[PDB]
Amino acid sequence: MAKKPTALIILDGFANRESEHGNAVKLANKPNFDRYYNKYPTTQIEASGLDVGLPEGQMGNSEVGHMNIGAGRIVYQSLTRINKSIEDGDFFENDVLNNAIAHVNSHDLHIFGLLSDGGVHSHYKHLFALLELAKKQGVEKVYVHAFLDGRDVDQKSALKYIEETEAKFNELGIGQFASVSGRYYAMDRDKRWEREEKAYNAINFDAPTYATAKEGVEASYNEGLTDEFVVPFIVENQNDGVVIFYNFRPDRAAQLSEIFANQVKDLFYATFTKYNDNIDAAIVFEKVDLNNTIGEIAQNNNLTQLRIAETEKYPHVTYFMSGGRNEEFKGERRRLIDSPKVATYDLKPEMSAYEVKDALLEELNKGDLDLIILNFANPDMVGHSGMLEPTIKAIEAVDECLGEVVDKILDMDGYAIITADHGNSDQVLTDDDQPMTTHTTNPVPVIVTKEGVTLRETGRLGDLAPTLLDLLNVEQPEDMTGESLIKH
Template identity: 45%
Template sequence: NRIGIGKIATISGRYYAMDRDKRWDRTKKAYDAIVLGKGVYAHSPMEAIDIAYSKDQTDEFVEPTVILENGKPVATVDAGDSIIFFNFRPDRARQLTRAFIDEVFNHFEREKGYLPVFFVSMTQYDETFENIHVAYKPERLDNTLGEYLSKKGIKQLRIAETEKYAHVTFFFNGGVEEPNEGEERILVPSPKVATYDLKPEMSAYEVTDTVIPKIMSNQYGFILLNFANPDMVGHTGVLNAAIKAIEAIDECLGRIVNAVQSVGGTIIITADHGNAEEMIDPVTKEPQTAHTTNPVPFIVIGEGDIDLRKDGILADIAPTVLDIMKLPIPQEMTGKSLIIGRK
């Protein structure tokens, strides 16, 4: 009743507030804007966006901006306040959350020190977090692909650079932090550059150099690898950089495919969303930095002459993997194998 539906006090691109690569200097800028009212200043949310756009900053890169009212920040955060964090993706929420909830915090100086606040997260960002209230606790997912393979005694490898490490571990395991039995994990550091258009190959070559000896060892029944480039470089909106990123991935995939085929394995190449394939908005002709809903490839190499269904969904991938591995599909997997015929 006092403030109606509330007021927008700060605006920040996810490059700062949602960093997940331990670039704590970025997190600090977002934190300082929220807590101290320090940053770029604007007199309205629209002016904040206009200022950013005038600097050619797309939404992801909007500098933490403080909205002023009568010459003062609309709001700051102090001890005893309540915070509801609406983000549901753990990987991009953890750093900013820790800046609020950790009593002992060494990643940057908090000018007001530790502020005891009532902090509510939409989902569970990390089961080890303290001083936090979770609105929607995680549901237990049984027989995820990694768990199922582990029960079958199949050794598996998960590998990615920092930007996508959570995707091949925590997310792929249904929100479970702990590795399955027989699950090995390799984290390759992402390059420390301001934006990935400055190094569009990112750490793809290092990931490839690391995984090929693992493939050649023939000790894993399943390897999951994520290349971050098409997504992360795509988000910059820089077309030439995205082209270089795809060229790097093309080279790396060629090496990996050759390695897999040399040991008689099968490789699936796919994605869960588009990005780099549409770098220019078809309507505005401006850089396109967001995910797309375009169909993505699903390529199977090394399985002989097969026919694949055309109308697949993500839930069909795990059953397809098990079909290739000649393993029964558990009842918890509601998808269907994409392989509809073998010649």
């Protein structure tokens, strides 16, 4: 039969902020959003930091946000999980780590990794935990092979990390630097194996040599070359030749993992996480499998669903919404609308929002949809320009589309949840009027277009799918630890 639709409408990069200064959200003329906001129940929810599985303080983002929305739970990221296992001790009881330690004592340990607190590919505090573990289980020879960042952190900051780590070597008693390589060598990913080789060699074959890590790095600086581009080198008398790789992101660790792996005998080789490097390694950390995301629950209650967005947020309403899964669920269909081909979207702030809107109206007119997941990309994609007037026009175009969409849903006696996945356009200028081109940490609005209900006064993205299921009168599975924003 024909169905009354329930729609989640994600205004990407659109959050609540008090001041109007650099606040495209407030300066925009958005009569439709404002009409719905004044008429219908509203609240505001957290989309950053620990509430979306990120470290405390970290702005949210589209990938994390769409995964938390779809999952109906906090989806904990790798960095957050590792940090928690250290704070809670699990790390030190880790079988693959205690195995590794036992193996070098029976043959009586190198450590590879990006040495910074960038948190994109690694974190050196995890190195500090490896050391401490080895100091508990009494390891004698620990050699640290350092890859220098300058890319996820300040361009010239390696000396700070090296100094803190040797202090740890001293405050702890074991460990030393055998080799030092800019990530431009040890963490290439564009199949540039001339660069990988220099790093392989430093780790003790033909390669530059210096008396300390500090010395080689300072030599690089004097030659105009910062941390990322540091030519690999050995630390004098400190590298006795040849293992744990504490990077947790595969794409930049794989090529070096393949050179090293692809002649030594009886080598224990572990990676913090499984890389696509084609070799047999012990894996320190296993992923959480996400099941019973909203798409799966819709499918298992025989509901039809639509995922729709233009190119820039199409992965987000498909792969990320479905919990890291490309395959459609049974009953699921999708509409991809091509984004404009421009280098930056301030050149066409309406992007393809009107074509997204028209495609949605086409699908709603079929009358066969239980569940709709729609994203309007514009506030985030234009707000990354740090330009106020383009981002205003982006929000105004979305607001006009939003009115046609929500009015049709309401005329089909359906329901909409209007929200966002994190902030951006709520601050496109700094307080000194410079461009502000990142996401924000601000909480996101929520409108539920059902009269006579009351919403909880706070929440998080993990609560949105429970709310949808509430409106659908569908049972919520245990895997979804979030809670519906509608009070009962």
